[PDB]
Design a protein around this ligand. Structure first.
Ligand SMILES: CCOC(=O)Cn1cnc(S(=O)(=O)n2ccc3ncc(CCc4cc(OC)cc(OC)c4)nc32)c1
Ligand SMILES: CCOC(=O)Cn1cnc(S(=O)(=O)n2ccc3ncc(CCc4cc(OC)cc(OC)c4)nc32)c1
Lengths: 285, 298
């Protein structure tokens, strides 16, 4: 029913399902051991993540999973994005096999390493936070070089591997170039004014979202425009209101966020420009 | 900005927010005490539920909340649906005030009242003193049939009739909820679907799935599945069978087997609901007749 692609196809009998990593609401991700998914050593088994449909999945969710799979093939390999490893498409339910990130999403990762319970031995230094940002800028610079927009860049959609590599995830809303559906399904506190009002999206709209992600990061998983409801945000952005500086954040980095939150997308930095500026700061730290 | 509607508008200073009842995927519902929302007794306070936007809300979620609010005004009052009590629309964030259902959604309600040892029974959530009898399940079904008969009499279709979207009050009254996908087909004889609809596939009638049409007889099919859900005490339909592999099976005439906790009669009612020709399915009127009859004999 779903067309064949031998390049990516993985045999079902070698995949072994495991514990659910999380239910996003339109999708389901489970841990799994996969034998010989790494072609260079066919005998060894490796822990992967498998996205599949819910039981209460809709008609739209099946095409969105396939769309996302197709997006992941043409994006190509990068260190700072979740990468496609394989798929089970034939004669069974659709399993999309992607890299495993053992330390979860960046929001929980950061909240867990703030200096209830759940707090580990390893807490976040300034150099560590800057290195998170720079890693994510590289990921996003790559996506932009592939003429691809993400449109859902949030801390919750960034995953962290065992070796604390930041990986950008969820290419659900991702598109190749954009004229919006007039009713796009994009989170409002991360959305650039153009995406919100003018139904357009460029790479410069992702830069704005990156602006908010930086704030998220330097508040160690804070939630943007705290206390301000979505209804009351539209008018504030039009008046030029922006978020204050996080406490564990230099004047320089804050100015980088504020550069990201220009209302005129061309006056914002490009991802290339952010990678330049963040490497510079990472070196000096 | 949101227009005035004095009939429904409620003053913000009298509403008192409380614990979050749930985080759904694109909604937030919190408990609240509201003073004088019932005009007939202005001094008394009542426990209500307030739907509002998440912090991580989308552009689409704002119109959907307002749309749903408007749907709830024209549907009117019934015992077996969640009813609109009021709204805060002016000079602040949008609070839609609806009836409170203290025992949660019907799926968790049923799983919590399964016998011990069952797949979904947890010691911390389980209420075995309120274990589910046969008459209790039939009474759930009948109550929901009445709710749905009402909706159909208002020439309204639900399109998302699932156990998770049925709530249970303190007095174990079944209330049909989520009018997000609900549509009015008063003038238009049926509903013409979009390509790639946002309806759950295992509850969807073949017409809705293949022919992009929806009538009240499509809701009957969904009710068929809800019955199965109920008599499996919150089971999930077509168990083991993935959505991909369901399309072909329905076209070949595959249907779900009888739940063990279910008579031959009730199963035949489900299968009547799952007829391939929507007119040969019972109407909600016909289900209410048949279920009352069975409820009386128990
Ligand atoms: C589509 C929803 O999942 C996400 O991509 C975003 N997400 C947010 N939180 C999570 S998780 O907490 O459930 N999670 C926790 C550990 C963990 N390890 C790996 C994954 C991979 C999820 C995934 C699936 C996937 O399937 C097509 C594509 C992806 O990148 C685009 C990423 N997800 C993991 C996942
Ligand atoms: C949209 C995502 O948010 C949800 O998960 C929707 N939801 C449906 N049931 C629940 S609940 O399990 O958290 N819940 C538990 C107790 C409880 N009491 C009342 C309500 C009311 C939900 C509601 C809000 C509402 O506001 C528009 C309209 C409704 O019916 C049409 C129903 N919901 C209650 C939540």
């Amino acid at each position: 029913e779903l067309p064949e692609d031998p390049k990516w196809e993985f045999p079902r009998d070698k995949l072994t399902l495991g514990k659910p990593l999380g239910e996003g609401c339109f999708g389901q991700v489970v841990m799994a051991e996969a034998v010989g998914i790494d072609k260079d050593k066919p005998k060894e088994a490796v822990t992967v993540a498998v996205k599949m449909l819910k039981d209460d999945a809709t008609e739209k969710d099946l095409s969105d999973l396939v769309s996302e799979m197709e997006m992941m093939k043409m994006i190509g390999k990068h260190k700072n994005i979740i990468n496609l490893l394989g798929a089970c498409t034939q004669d069974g339910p659709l399993y999309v096999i992607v890299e495993y990130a053992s330390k979860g999403n960046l929001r929980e990762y950061l909240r867990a390493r703030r200096p209830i319970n759940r707090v580990p031995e390893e807490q976040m230094t300034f150099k560590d936070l800057v290195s998170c940002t720079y890693q994510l800028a590289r990921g996003m610079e790559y996506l932009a070089s592939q003429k691809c927009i993400h449109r859902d860049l949030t801390a919750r959609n960034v995953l962290v591997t065992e070796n604390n590599v930041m990986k950008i995830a969820d290419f659900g809303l991702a598109r190749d170039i954009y004229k919006k559906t007039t009713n796009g399904r994009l989170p409002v506190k991360w959305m650039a004014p153009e995406a919100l009002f003018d139904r357009v999206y460029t790479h410069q709209s992702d830069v704005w979202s990156f602006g908010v992600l930086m704030w998220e990061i330097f508040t160690l998983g804070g939630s943007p425009y705290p206390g301000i409801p979505v209804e009351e945000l539209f008018k504030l952005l039009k008046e030029g209101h922006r978020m204050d500086k996080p406490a564990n954040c230099t004047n320089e980095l804050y100015m980088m966020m504020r550069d990201c939150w220009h209302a005129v997308p061309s006056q914002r930095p490009t991802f290339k420009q952010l990678v330049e500026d963040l490497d510079r700061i990472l070196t000096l730290t």
